[PDB]
Amino acid sequence: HDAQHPCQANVAVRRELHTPASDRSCTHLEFDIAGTGLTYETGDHVGVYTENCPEVVEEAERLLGYSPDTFFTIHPSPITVRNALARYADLLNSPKKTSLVALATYASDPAEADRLRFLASAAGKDEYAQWVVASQRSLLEVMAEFPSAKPPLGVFFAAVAPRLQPRYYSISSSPSMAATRIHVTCALVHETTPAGRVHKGVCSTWIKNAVPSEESKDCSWAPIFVRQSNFKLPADPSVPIIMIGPGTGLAPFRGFLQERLAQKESGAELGPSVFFFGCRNSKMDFIYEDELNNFLEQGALSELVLAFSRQGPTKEYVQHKMAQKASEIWDMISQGAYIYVCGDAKGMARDVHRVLHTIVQEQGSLDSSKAESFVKNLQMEGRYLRDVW
Numbered sequence: 465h466d467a468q469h470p471c472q473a474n475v476a477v478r479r480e481l482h483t484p485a486s487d488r489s490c491t492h493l494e495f496d497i498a499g500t501g502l503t504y505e506t507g508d509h510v511g512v513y514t515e516n517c518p519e520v521v522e523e524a525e526r527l528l529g530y531s532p533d534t535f536f537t538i539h540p541s542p543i544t545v546r547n548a549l550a551r552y553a554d555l556l557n558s559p560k561k562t563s564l565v566a567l568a569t570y571a572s573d574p575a576e577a578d579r580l581r582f583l584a585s586a587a588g589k590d591e592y593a594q595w596v597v598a599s600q601r602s603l604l605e606v607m608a609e610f611p612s613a614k615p616p617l618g619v620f621f622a623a624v625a626p627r628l629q630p631r632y633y634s635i636s637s638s639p640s641m642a643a644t645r646i647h648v649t650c651a652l653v654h655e656t657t658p659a660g661r662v663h664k665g666v667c668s669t670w671i672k673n674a675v676p677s678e679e680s681k682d683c684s685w686a687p688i689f690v691r692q693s694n695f696k697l698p699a700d701p702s703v704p705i706i707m708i709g710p711g712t713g714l715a716p717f718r719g720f721l722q723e724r725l726a727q728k729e730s731g732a733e734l735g736p737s738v739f740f741f742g743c744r745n746s747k748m749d750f751i752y753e754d755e756l757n758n759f760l761e762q763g764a765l766s767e768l769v770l771a772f773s774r775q776g777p778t779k780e781y782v783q784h785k786m787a788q789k790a791s792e793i794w795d796m797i798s799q800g801a802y803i804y805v806c807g808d809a810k811g812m813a814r815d816v817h818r819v820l821h822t823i824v825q826e827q828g829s830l831d832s833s834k835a836e837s838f839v840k841n842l843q844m845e846g847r848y849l850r851d852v853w
């Protein structure tokens with residue numbers, strides 16, 4: 465038991481990773497798994513259940529009209545509307561068309577009812593793609609556009625608001641180094657939607673403000689669990705590895721270096737390791753310097769290559785850094801090296817992928833058709849792994 469469904473795990477430590485000279489944030493959190501069945505391996509993810517900000521919840525109460533003190537059974541033991549809006553209602557994401565049909569049914573204003581049925585309808589698929597999805601309008605924003613849509617409480621949790629999803633995180637710790645704590649490295653998500661809403665990331669803000677048992681015993685806690693991933697180190701340490709996680713994509717790789725370090729003390733020569741890390745600035749964004757210098761100092765990581773998004777005049781990214789070490793990358797690829805990419809899927813991952821096609825031919829001497837197939841074969845061999853979100 466206790467894998468599919470969550471295990472209450474208090475939060476032991478919660479530390480800010482950036483310097484006070486950084487205008488962003490990134491949180492180091494450790495969940496205390498002592499006394500639980502929870503087990504994890506290097507490269508795994510941890511699912512974390514959180515709750516909505518109180519202000520968000522306050523707004524949902526305003527628009528629904530319910531009594532928060534109303535106890536009802538979410539589809540045992542009942543729950544209040546206020547607690548269900550907090551831990552079980554996805555309030556801030558954009559309503560699906562089926563949710564708009566439900567809303568429309570309880571829209572007592574005929575034009576509000578017509579616009580909703582339209583937005584869900586086929587002849588509305590263009591406007592629904594722009595006004596709702598493109599603009600990143602929440603369920604809460606939509607209901608404010610149609611104050612007449614007053615679905616009953618059953619209908620709301622059954623159809624309008626889907627369940628608050630658990631947020632997944634790459635464990636940044638290895639069991640050998642801390643078999644009693646799950647380490648998560650979590651950047652603070654804080655954006656403005658095209659429609660001008662200011663969105664606090666939901667699990668990220670919880671983590672950024674979680675009270676750790678190392679500073680109080682009312683410490684925070686969250687239902688958590690572990691999902692097995694294929695983002696795994698090679699069985700043989702000797703095998704050469706390439707790691708390409710910048711910014712917050714370092715997290716898996718920190719548990720890669722704890723694994724082979726803990727092994728190395730009792731184990732064999734680890735062979736070549738090269739970690740490509742990128743971040744904005746030396747004096748702000750560099751998360752886990754001293755540990756990384758330590759992993760370099762004691763030979764856990766053979767080499768460490770960094771690019772600076774914005775510190776320098778030149779604005780280096782990691783893929784650019786890869787082009788500089790292209791010939792060497794290719795040698796490790798020919799040597800049997802595994803390559804890991806982790807971090808932002810839409811940009812870094814894509815550009816890192818494109819560099820790879822371009823980089824193989826420099827010594828591959830293959831054209832795009834041939835280079836494409838080669839790098840595709842690395843993926844089906846298991847050689848080339850991507851943990852991107």
Ligand SMILES: Cc1cc2nc3c(=O)[nH]c(=O)nc-3n(C[C@H](O)[C@H](O)[C@H](O)COP(=O)(O)OP(=O)(O)OC[C@H]3O[C@@H](n4cnc5c(N)ncnc54)[C@H](O)[C@@H]3O)c2cc1C
Pocket residue numbers: 509556557558599600601602631632633634648649650651652653655657663664665666667668669712713715851852853
């Ligand atoms: C395998 C894996 C590993 C991960 N590892 C890490 C990690 O190590 N560190 C880390 O920080 N994160 C990691 N993430 C990302 C993490 O899972 C969450 O996606 C992230 O932390 C979001 O925080 P949040 O839940 O508060 O954000 P959410 O509230 O879910 O917001 C997420 C995004 O939704 C956007 N958004 C806001 N409103 C809307 C709307 N109406 N419609 C559509 N979009 C909207 C926001 O702009 C934001 O970019 C990982 C994800 C995966 C899948």
Ligand SMILES: NC(=O)c1ccc[n+]([C@@H]2O[C@H](COP(=O)([O-])OP(=O)(O)OC[C@H]3O[C@@H](n4cnc5c(N)ncnc54)[C@H](OP(=O)(O)O)[C@@H]3O)[C@@H](O)[C@H]2O)c1
Pocket residue numbers: 651652653654655710711712713742743744772773774781782783807808810811812813815
């Ligand atoms: N709140 C947020 O976290 C937030 C807000 C807006 C957008 N995003 C997007 O989502 C990503 C998540 O950020 P993070 O937590 O991984 O830290 P980050 O903010 O991405 O910083 C990591 C580093 O990646 C660099 N980078 C940006 N785009 C890249 C690309 N296409 N190829 C290679 N490197 C690139 C960044 O450079 P520069 O930043 O100097 O360009 C930065 O130096 C961001 O990179 C950004 O594109 C995130």
